[PDB]
């Protein structure tokens, strides 16, 4: 029922509150004050508990701002002065900020838990089906709209409208074919030291273009900071990332990561030029997706009991063998050459390849043997790639034979 202004005026404020909650089908079953005694010692005892954490909220906030402005934050390397002060900047930031924010939160939780009254409140639900008049009437209105329209009679306009609707949808989404790309269309231009950009090739395919491709080791060189009257300049003009390597280099039971190093990008030996900028291209070679090759030297006792694969006989040169460093499972580096067991282990999902059984997987989720590179030595005695792999490198895909 409604209330006139005089009746609402006649009420007390608590009575208006009771009416307010009951208008939403809420009822306060129970509600009682925390400190009814007039000058309770427990109320002052609770106030001091709350002010403790508010004091520390203020202390922590001010300490955070002090730490954040005036604490020496800038980087120090090992052996520098004020190293310890730098290593603690972020720690102090967090302990002060945590002090501040946690103390504010605890103050508020305590205030609720011992000052605001306690209550049981009970609200009635209104859910499930609706009240049937509304169901019947909404169905009536929607059915009325559909039959009003007269579109159900016109099968031709409906069919054509749906056809135009779906075709307009196609017209909207068709430019998503700007993302579609044939995986078998090669990359632009000629072949690169990373291949033609298909899943077949690599840099080692360049042998088929009559290029001499050395096996090259990574020197891990960095740019050098020259400095002069016009500034400070990091440069790479006389620096080789990849350098040729020779068969004497690896002891037995050694492993070296080698990359394709065409003879045009070499800059080492007596033919070294101190202004021949090749670092960019050798870097492009080191970052080829499936360019890394694992070059192992077996012991003679091991090479006496190495098992060869059909067609991959004479790929090795003496005791030197060469496998693809890309795992045949889902493409991690197969870096872990257990030198004694002669097993190459992938640290991703723990596949194990037998270096004495043409790299056949003997454990893990891999199923195919590691591809093998044919290698030899040239007229100057540098190791070179005598051919290309006879397999697709890397993991498997739907279009791959065996």
């Amino acid at each position: 029922k409604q209330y006139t202004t005089q009746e609402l005026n006649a009420m007390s404020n608590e009575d208006l509150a009771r009416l307010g909650t009951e208008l939403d089908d809420v009822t306060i079953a129970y509600r009682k004050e925390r400190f009814p005694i007039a000058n309770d010692p427990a109320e002052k005892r609770a106030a001091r508990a709350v002010t403790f954490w508010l004091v520390l909220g203020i202390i922590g906030g001010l300490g955070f701002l002090a730490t954040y402005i005036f604490w020496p934050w800038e980087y120090k390397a090992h052996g520098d002065e004020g190293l310890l002060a730098y290593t603690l900047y972020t720690p102090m930031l967090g302990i002060t900020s945590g002090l501040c924010i946690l103390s504010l939160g605890f103050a508020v939780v305590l205030y609720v838990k011992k000052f605001i009254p306690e209550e049981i409140a009970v609200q009635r639900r209104h859910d499930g089906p609706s009240e049937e008049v509304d169901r019947r009437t909404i169905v009536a209105l929607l059915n009325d709209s559909w039959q009003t329209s007269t579109l159900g009679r016109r099968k031709l306009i409906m069919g054509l409208a749906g056809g135009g609707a779906v075709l307009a949808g196609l017209t909207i989404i068709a430019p998503m074919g700007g993302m579609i790309k044939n995986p078998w269309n090669p990359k632009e231009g000629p072949m690169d030291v990373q291949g033609d950009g298909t899943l077949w090739t690599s840099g080692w395919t360049l042998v088929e273009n009559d290029v001499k491709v050395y096996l090259g080791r990574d020197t891990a060189a960095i740019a050098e900071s020259h400095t002069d009257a016009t500034g400070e300049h990091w440069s790479t003009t006389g620096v080789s990332r990849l350098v040729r390597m020779r068969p004497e280099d690896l002891a037995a039971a050694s492993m070296e990561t080698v990359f394709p190093l065409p003879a045009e990008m070499v800059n080492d030996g007596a033919e070294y030029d101190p202004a021949k900028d090749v670092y960019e291209h050798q870097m492009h070679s080191v970052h080829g997706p499936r360019n890394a090759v694992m070059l192992i030297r077996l012991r003679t006792a091991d090479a006496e009991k190495v098992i060869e694969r059909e067609g991959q006989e004479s790929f090795h040169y003496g005791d030197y063998y060469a496998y693809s460093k890309i795992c045949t499972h889902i493409g991690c580096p197969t870096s872990l050459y257990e030198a004694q067991t002669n097993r190459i282990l992938c640290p991703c999902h723990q596949s194990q390849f037998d270096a004495l059984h043409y790299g056949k997987p003997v454990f893990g989720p891999a199923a195919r043997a590691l591809p093998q590179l044919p290698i030899t030595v040239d007229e100057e005695g540098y190791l070179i790639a005598a051919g290309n792999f006879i397999e697709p490198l890397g993991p498997a895909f739907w279009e791959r034979k065996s």
């Binding site: 307010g20 939403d24 809420v26 079953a29 129970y30 005694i37 934050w73 972020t90 720690p91 930031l93 967090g94 302990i95 900020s97 945590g98 924010i101 946690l102 103390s103 504010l104 939160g105 939780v109 205030y111 609720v112 049981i120 409140a121 009970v122 009635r124 639900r125 859910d127 579609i180 790309k181 044939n182 995986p183 078998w184 950009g197 298909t198 899943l199 990574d218 960095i222 740019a223 050098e224 990091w234 970052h287 360019n291 890394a292 889902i330 493409g331 991690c332 580096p333 991703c348 999902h349 723990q350 989720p365 891999a366 199923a367 498997a396 895909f397 739907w398 279009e399 034979k401 065996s402």
Partner: protein, 534 residues
């Protein structure tokens, strides 16, 4: 202050008094585990704000540069702009490392809070009718949060993260019949590519956050509309809600718990390193590390790849790689998680409108399925980091792979058995109390030398003195006497001295009256509910 003018203007312009009265009067049930969704909300807000901060300093490009930044142990090293600007966030911006680590800790908290929230929803039965929609969108939310963290930590372009991207790429090419084309569409070419980091960056900062926020919004709106579930208890019916109102109690409690969450993340962000990209170096396809592993919320996928045997089909000119079945496994367990309410309704035949919850002891099939799935996921997660486990607990690696394999059958089954029997046992303990009364712990000796334990009944008695057994009511039954209040202190004062005896007597009288009337109102509401059921 002249708030009358503000309220009058707003009300005269919007007619808002009734609509706002409805929201300050809304009631929420106040069980503790109804705060586990809140954590996910708050950590999400932290993720948003810290994320925008990071975007003011980050360049997501795969273009290369020679480094000349703060961190001297990598100066002169060729690296992408992504890795370079992550290092600049970490070392050349004041407090940048703090906000970075806070962002990552917030991500971890977001995902695990979603997990434990979903487990509350599962074990209590809050998914069933009328609330299945929140279940479907919540499963979507946990999946998108996982994807979001993956794309997020793939951005800084360090070695570990790039190995993760390599593994993603390898799994997408392996798909029949369309994996190669899907890969060339997603990555714009072969991996790595120009637009991969740009696409992961805009997926991470814009697309997936937008879907996540929109679905969190729909989720919270449905939770607000369909009022919250509750456990059984005195006065509680299918047709009501008992708890506290929005104004003042629950809103303040929400703000305070939010402050606690923010401060805990701030603290983590200072006192513990996470990720530490500067030790890992830049990404190189030819390098790897022993402690690989994705982030924790992805280790299950990793473990699924480690426990799978090398089962491949040659057809013969086409190939089905061995990881395809891992994708099938993930698809199965996603579908089974998202469609579980309908599975339970098929095999139980229950389809009523449920607003009360179930204690997990009382629904033991679901609790046992839950714990067995927990054990399957635990063994996948430990299978992921199984080589770290092997290194750090002197277990053979291969032993851990076979432990993972066999465990993913025998662990779930043993878990089902043990869980089921413990559930029935807890039921029987509650029925003991409702049959014979609380075991007080007192043993008396009678004149005939019989040692008898003194029981406290929770109901009437027959003239023999034996309780009249009460029916179970789906609520918690007190097991010890101190739950009834017989241990409660009756002195009052500070730690170092008592109050004056006048105040203490008065206060204890007042407290006794409080307890009596709270019991009376719940008893009256209980009787009223019986009467409403006629």
């Amino acid at each position: 202050m002249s708030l009358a003018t503000v309220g009058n203007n707003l009300d005269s312009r919007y007619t808002m008094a009734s609509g706002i009265r409805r929201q300050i009067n809304k009631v929420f049930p106040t069980h503790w585990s109804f705060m586990l969704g809140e954590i996910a909300l708050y950590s999400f807000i932290v993720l948003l704000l810290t994320g925008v901060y990071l975007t003011l300093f980050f360049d997501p490009s795969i273009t290369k540069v020679i480094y000349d930044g703060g961190y001297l142990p990598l100066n002169g090293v060729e690296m992408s702009r992504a890795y370079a600007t992550a290092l600049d966030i970490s070392f050349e911006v004041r407090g940048g490392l703090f906000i970075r680590q806070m962002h990552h800790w917030a991500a971890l908290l977001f995902v695990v809070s979603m997990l434990v929230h979903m487990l509350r929803i599962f074990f209590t039965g809050a998914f069933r009718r009328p609330r299945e929609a929140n279940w479907i969108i919540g499963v979507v939310l946990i999946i998108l949060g996982m994807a979001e963290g993956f794309m997020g930590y793939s951005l800084p372009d360090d070695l570990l993260s790039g190995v993760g991207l390599r593994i993603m790429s390898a799994i997408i090419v392996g798909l029949p019949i369309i994996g190669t084309w899907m890969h060339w569409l997603i990555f714009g070419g072969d991996f790595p590519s120009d637009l991969m980091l740009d696409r992961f960056y805009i997926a991470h900062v814009l697309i997936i956050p937008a879907i996540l926020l929109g679905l969190i919004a729909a989720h919270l709106a449905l939770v607000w509309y369909q009022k919250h579930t509750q456990f059984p208890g005195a006065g509680r019916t299918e047709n009501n809600v008992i708890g506290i109102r929005i104004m003042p109690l629950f809103a303040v409690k929400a703000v305070a718990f939010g402050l606690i969450v923010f401060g805990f993340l701030a603290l983590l962000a200072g006192v513990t390193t996470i990720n530490a990209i500067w030790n890992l170096g830049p990404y190189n396809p030819s390098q790897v590390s022993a402690g690989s592993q994705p982030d924790v919320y992805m280790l299950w996928t990793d473990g699924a790849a480690r426990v799978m045997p090398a089962w491949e089909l040659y057809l013969g000119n086409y190939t089905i790689p061995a990881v395809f079945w891992v994708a099938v496994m993930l698809g199965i367990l996603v579908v089974l998680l998202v469609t579980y309410p309908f599975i339970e309704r098929k095999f139980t035949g229950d389809d009523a409108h449920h607003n009360l919850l179930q204690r997990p002891r009382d629904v033991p099939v679901r609790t046992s399925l839950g714990v067995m799935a927990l054990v399957f996921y635990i063994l996948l997660t430990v299978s992921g980091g199984n080589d770290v486990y092997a290194m750090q607990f002197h277990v053979s690696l291969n032993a851990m792979t076979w432990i993972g394999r066999i465990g993913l059958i025998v662990g779930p089954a043993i878990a089902y058995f043990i869980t089921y029997r413990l559930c029935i046992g807890l039921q029987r303990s509650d029925r003991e109390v409702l049959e014979h009364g609380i075991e007080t712990g007192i043993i008396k000796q009678m004149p005939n030398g019989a040692f008898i334990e003194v029981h406290q009944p929770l109901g009437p008695v027959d003239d023999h003195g034996h309780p009249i057994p009460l029916p179970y009511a789906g609520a918690a039954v007190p097991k010890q006497m101190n739950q009834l209040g017989y241990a409660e202190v009756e002195t009052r004062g500070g730690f170092f001295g008592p109050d004056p005896e006048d105040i203490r007597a008065k206060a204890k009288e007042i407290e006794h009256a409080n307890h009596i009337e709270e019991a009376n109102t719940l008893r009256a509401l209980n009787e009223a509910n019986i009467e409403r059921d006629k």
